């Protein structure tokens, strides 16, 4: 909605002049860090966002999807005023969003978690190699740019298309924390951009990713019912913790 644009006008205020620990804006120093490192992940603490207002924190537990797209463009605006450049560097920065309890583990998940950002934790299992995803579409003409997708692609040209690395990692629940007489159920995890390669098999990993379904997907043969797949599109990655 257009009203949500006004929200941006607020969150930018949270993005720069917000201070903590006696002056010295933290998020200003993060933008300065990348910044110099130019690693294109801007990192916003949930603790602080929730500290300023609970209304946005509530938006993170309701509808993270379109709000991150609203938010990171503004982050790009803040980097734009701080470093009048990076029109040539990545032109997108998607925010990492540190710890968000919740702190649902694995095996405890329901429909109520759909479309809403949720923290998960557990051991990594062997990960697929890095296969560039289509993302943005562009050509010399010759229709215009078509974003597809996460993850459908319905309903190919290519000239210069901006690829972004994809990686799918299967996250299994930690063996120590398993309640007796229960098998360690596990979920699919979709990394994107820089989150790629941060993971290694054998390790416990803390992920903030949102939960997703689509699209049946494929069973319809052995289920009996219209049952969707369960795939956590990932947001951040941290060692345990």
């Amino acid at each position: 909605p257009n009203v949500s644009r006004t929200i941006a006008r607020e969150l930018k205020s949270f993005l720069l002049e917000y201070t903590d620990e006696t002056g010295r804006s933290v998020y200003g120093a993060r933008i300065r860090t990348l910044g110099e490192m130019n690693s294109e992940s801007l990192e916003v603490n949930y603790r602080h966002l929730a500290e300023s207002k609970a209304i946005l924190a509530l938006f993170l537990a309701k509808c993270p999807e379109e709000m991150l797209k609203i938010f990171d463009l503004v982050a790009m605006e803040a980097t734009e005023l701080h470093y009048p450049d990076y029109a040539r560097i990545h032109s997108e920065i998607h925010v990492r969003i540190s710890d968000f309890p919740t702190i649902y583990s694995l095996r405890e998940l329901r429909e109520s978690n759909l479309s809403s950002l949720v923290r998960v934790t557990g051991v990594v299992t062997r990960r697929t190699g890095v296969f560039p995803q289509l993302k943005y579409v562009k050509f010399n003409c010759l229709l215009g740019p078509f974003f597809q997708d996460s993850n459908e692609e319905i309903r190919v040209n290519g000239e210069k298309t901006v690829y972004r690395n994809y990686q799918r990692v299967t996250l299994q629940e930690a063996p120590g924390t398993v309640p007796p007489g229960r098998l360690p159920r596990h979920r699919e995890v979709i990394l994107l951009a820089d989150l790629v390669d941060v993971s290694k098999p054998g390790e416990e990993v803390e992920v903030t990713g949102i939960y997703k379904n689509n699209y049946d997907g494929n069973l319809n043969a052995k289920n009996g019912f219209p049952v969707f797949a369960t795939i956590i599109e990932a947001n951040s990655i941290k060692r345990r913790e």
Binding site: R182, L183, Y215, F225, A229, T230
Partner: protein
């Protein structure tokens, strides 16, 4: 185009009123120190606290009212009454209470029947099945009710799609799309629920080896999801149904897949 009209449900309305009046009225045996008042109104009111959108009522209580004659419509013909028991129950809640998914689970059935005693006469009927769980599976969403449209192109129709196919929406549309067209899949308007499958197997003490005990599918739909454990005996609510996996439908291969809307660790 007016739809004229709907028909007839007959007995279904009688069972609607009987069940409504039953869940309303006592339903109380004990006097003095109770166990008195109500208990089901107090059940819904106690339920208002956590608002987990499920109810628990005893079958034994339900048999007491008509001397079991009420329980018979709810026995063999039971699945005919699923849409009636739900909406009907809501007609109660709307009266006594202020986002609606309601899972009704009966329990405490007069007699427990083994998987071997399972018959094709028991279909559409509550039957209690005892046996050990094998191969639990991860919880995933059911489509439940969906808006899949448009479907050519602006329609945005949200209805039905409750039965398990899931194909298809957009039929007899919009008014008026005349799709055909795309299905089309929209998952943001469609509420989901539950579920996890467990493959139930007969206990080993009953089976006369050489036996080779015969497992059968029971899918847990409802909030009883996850209540089941591997290597242990459980009692379920019957709703036997069937699932596709013999004649043809001309202008089909089926097998028994047992349903449970309630779970307990008994056994």
């Amino acid at each position: 185009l007016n739809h004229v009209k709907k028909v007839d449900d007959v007995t279904g309305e009688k069972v609607r009123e009987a069940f409504e009046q039953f869940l309303e009225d006592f339903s109380v045996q004990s006097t003095d120190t109770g166990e008195v008042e109500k208990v089901y109104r107090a059940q819904i009111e106690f339920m208002k606290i956590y608002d987990l959108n499920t109810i628990y009522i005893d079958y034994q209580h339900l048999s007491m009212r008509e001397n079991g004659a009420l329980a018979m419509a709810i026995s063999e013909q039971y699945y005919r009454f699923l849409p009636f028991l739900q909406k009907g129950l809501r007609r109660v809640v709307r009266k006594y209470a202020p986002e609606r998914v309601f899972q009704i689970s009966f329990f405490n059935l007069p007699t427990v029947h083994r998987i071997r005693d399972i018959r094709s006469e028991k279909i559409g009927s509550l039957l209690s099945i005892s046996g050990t769980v094998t191969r639990t599976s991860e919880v995933r969403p059911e489509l439940y009710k969906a808006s899949f449209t448009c479907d050519m192109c602006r329609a945005i129709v949200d209805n039905v799609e409750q039965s398990f196919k899931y194909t298809e929406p957009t039929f007899c549309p919009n008014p008026s799309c005349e799709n055909r067209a795309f299905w089309t899949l929209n998952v943001t308007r469609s509420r989901f629920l539950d579920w996890q499958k467990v493959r139930i197997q007969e206990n080993a003490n009953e089976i006369p080896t050489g036996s080779m005990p015969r497992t059968l599918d029971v899918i847990l739909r409802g909030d009883s999801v996850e209540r089941a454990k591997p290597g242990d005996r459980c009692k379920f609510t019957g709703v036997e149904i069937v699932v596709p996996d013999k004649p043809s439908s001309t202008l089909l291969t089926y097998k028994i897949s047992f349903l449970a809307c309630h779970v307990i660790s008994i056994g």
